[PDB]
């Protein structure tokens, strides 16, 4: 998904005037927050059992 | 021969058409080709 963002951000100095590229639907932050909360609760669990 | 969208006294880019797009400040020089 970062590579798709990088491809569009490397292509954007060549589009015609008046054309934006928008990202309406994107299940990247769902996966990112859903694994980040697991990493946070792993750290909280080991520190808390300590 | 043009009819609309281009009146008298205008300027037209005719050489050096690779680092240009509509919406950027570009300097001027008279054209090399006739």
Swiss-Prot record, chain A:
Gene deletion effect: Disruption of MexA, MexB and OprM significantly reduces active efflux of N-(3-oxododecanoyl) homoserine lactone/3-oxo-C12-HSL/PAI-1, but not N-butyryl homoserine lactone/C4-HSL/PAI-2.
Induction / repression: By growth under severe iron limitation.
Stretches that traverse the bilayer: 38-50
Subcellular location: Cell inner membrane
Record-stated family: Belongs to the resistance-nodulation-cell division (RND) (TC 2.A.6) family.
Function: The inner membrane transporter component of the MexAB-OprM efflux system that confers multidrug resistance. Functions as the major efflux pump for n-hexane and p-xylene efflux. Has been shown in one study to be involved in the active efflux of the autoinducer N-(3-oxododecanoyl) homoserine lactone, thereby playing an indirect role in quorum-sensing; but has been shown in another study not to be involved in efflux of this autoinducer. Over-expression of the pump increases antibiotic and solvent efflux capacities. Implicated in the secretion of the siderophore pyoverdine.
Assembly mode: Component of the MexAB-OprM multidrug efflux complex, composed of six MexA subunits forming a hexameric tube, binding to a MexB trimer, which interact with the trimeric OprM outer membrane channel protein. OprM is thought to not directly contact MexB; instead, MexA joins MexB and OprM by forming a funnel-like hexamer anchored to the inner membrane. MexA may initially form a hexameric ring complex with MexB prior to OprM, then OprM undergoes a conformational change as it contacts MexA, allowing the periplasmic gate to open.
Additional facts recorded: Pyridopyrimidine derivatives, such as ABI-PP, are not exported by the MexAB-OprM efflux pump, bind tightly to a MexB hydrophobic pocket and so potentiate the activities of antibiotics such as erythromycin.
Protein name as annotated: Multidrug resistance protein MexB
Organism: Pseudomonas aeruginosa (strain ATCC 15692 / DSM 22644 / CIP 104116 / JCM 14847 / LMG 12228 / 1C / PRS 101 / PAO1)
Gene coding for it: mexB
From-to range in the entire protein, with total length: 303 to 352 of 1046
From Swiss-Prot, chain B:
Knockout or disruption consequences: Disruption of MexA, MexB and OprM significantly reduces active efflux of N-(3-oxododecanoyl) homoserine lactone/3-oxo-C12-HSL/PAI-1, but not N-butyryl homoserine lactone/C4-HSL/PAI-2.
Location in the cell: Cell inner membrane
Induction, per UniProt: By growth under severe iron limitation.
Domain of life where this protein originates: Bacteria
Subunit structure: Component of the MexAB-OprM multidrug efflux complex, composed of six MexA subunits forming a hexameric tube, binding to a MexB trimer, which interact with the trimeric OprM outer membrane channel protein. OprM is thought to not directly contact MexB; instead, MexA joins MexB and OprM by forming a funnel-like hexamer anchored to the inner membrane. MexA may initially form a hexameric ring complex with MexB prior to OprM, then OprM undergoes a conformational change as it contacts MexA, allowing the periplasmic gate to open.
Reported function: The periplasmic linker component of the MexAB-OprM efflux system that confers multidrug resistance. Functions as the major efflux pump for n-hexane and p-xylene efflux. Has been shown in one study to be involved in the active efflux of the autoinducer N-(3-oxododecanoyl) homoserine lactone, thereby playing an indirect role in quorum-sensing; but has been shown in another study not to be involved in efflux of this autoinducer. Over-expression of the pump increases antibiotic and solvent efflux capacities. Implicated in the secretion of the siderophore pyoverdine.
Family: Belongs to the membrane fusion protein (MFP) (TC 8.A.1) family.
Miscellaneous note of the record: In both X-ray crystal structures approximately the last 100 residues are not ordered.
Protein name (Swiss-Prot/TrEMBL): Multidrug resistance protein MexA
First-to-last residue of the parent protein present: 333 to 366 of 383
């Amino acid at each position: 998904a970062k590579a798709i963002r990088q491809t569009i951000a490397n292509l954007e100095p060549f589009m015609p005037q008046g054309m934006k590229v928008v990202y309406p639907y994107d299940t990247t932050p769902v996966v990112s927050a859903s694994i980040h909360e697991v990493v946070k609760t792993l750290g909280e669990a080991i520190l808390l059992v300590f | 021969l043009v009819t609309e969208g281009l009146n008298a006294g205008d300027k037209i880019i005719t050489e050096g058409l690779q680092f240009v797009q509509p919406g950027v400040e570009v300097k001027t020089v008279p054209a090399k080709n006739v």
